[PDB]
Amino acid sequence: IINTSILSLRYHLIDLSRYASKINIGSRVNFDPIDKNQIQLFNLESSKIEVILKIVYNSMYENFSTSFWIKIPISLNNEYTIINCIENNSGWKVSLNYGEIIWTLQDNKQNIQRVVFKNRWIFITITNNRLTKSKIYINGRLIDQKPISNLGNIHSNKIMFKLDGCRDPRRYIMIKYFNLFDKELNEKEIKDLYDSQSNSGILKDFWGNYLQYDKPYYMLNLFDPNKYVDVNNVGIRGYMYLKGSSGLYMGTKFIIKKYASGNKDNIVRNNDRVYINVVVNNKEYRLATNASQAGVEKILSALEIPDIGNLSQVVVMKSKNDQGIRNKCKMNLQDNNGNDIGFIGFHKFNDIYKLVASNWYNRQIEISSRTFGCSWEFIPV
User: Which is a Gene Ontology cellular component entry for this protein (predicted)?
Assistant: First the structure.
């Protein structure tokens, strides 16, 4: 559905839609150096992008849609405009406030319809049909809608990306992959749009940021997000486990270490082979097991790095791209010859949920049978 866009803003910034179209960038716009399509808009004039569509009437008179990713990273809160396409007091805009993302249509008869959604990357899609409603979707899912059949006609030639009326000097927004469409997208097309752009060869943290090497994370097991990971002693005779939960223990910190990646950047990619380090009392240890002993469930331990020997420690990182409610990760432990030991999960032994690598998970997947407990999220420390 992206190939049918009437504007596709992509990093220079350029419109890649079948139609050319003019971009003006002010001096104070920033692009992430690692992900150039990651646009940073600050609370400054010069921190503006102006898009001149070059025909408004046709395509978007009666029905049209917009999509983009956003992150919003003394209390000085108030409604401010972030994307503006109003002229002769009619058109549309996106606006932000505390706990609010706001869509506003205006129609020349001074009539206005407002739709609202109440530190995370979120995928927004807004659809419009003068015959029916304005609709807000978040991560491919309908959150709110308002009838707009009572509104009049809507002819702007110009879209302005700029914080307007924001009174906090530190406020900034992140946008990426802005598109305009000449039709009212349906729920299936929006899911497919989200799923395409979301489901990727890059692992994500809990907030949807790129997962990184050499960065401390807390590990969340999606079987029970109320449990934190703890260590029962360092060494092969100890183990890691899950235990039930201001004064809030978040558990043991994990660090993902490069092993086989030839990438100089520090983003964890799908199928990267890595080591996992565990921090215990401000010292690093290696996640590992002895796959030559025991049953299928290989209990994971925190090893002294100098004493790892030939223990199994190589982890294949995987993004799990199902329904996009969560930034799910899996970890397949391997020996030093590329043989699968098993996905990392947990097993209840003596009423403790001990971390394990188990080929049971891999065997279930092989025969299309249910797994649980082998899905993780990484929360930056």
Answer: extracellular region
Experimental method reported for this structure? X-ray
* Torsion (CA) 228, 234, 237, 239 in degrees, nearest 10: 10
CA-CA distance, 327 to 202, in Å (whole number)? 10
Q: Give the other-Cβ count within 10 Å of 200's Cβ.
A: 13
- Same-domain pairing of 161 and 236: no
Reported resolution in A? Answer: 1.5
3 state SS of 156 = coil
Pick the closest to residue 376 from 333, 345, 341 (CA basis). 345
Q: Give the end of a domain, one of 198, 226, 246.
A: 198
Provide the domain limits for residue 103: 2-198
Give yes or no for a contact between 304 and 285, defined as CB atoms under 8 angstroms apart: yes
Q: What is the DSSP letter of 85?
A: E
Q: Compute the distance between CA of residue 42 and CA of residue 26 in angstroms, rounded to an integer.
A: 11
CATH number at residue 243: 2.80.10.50
Cβ-based neighbour number of residue 375 at 10 Å: 19
* Inter-residue contact 31 to 162 (CB < 8 Å): no
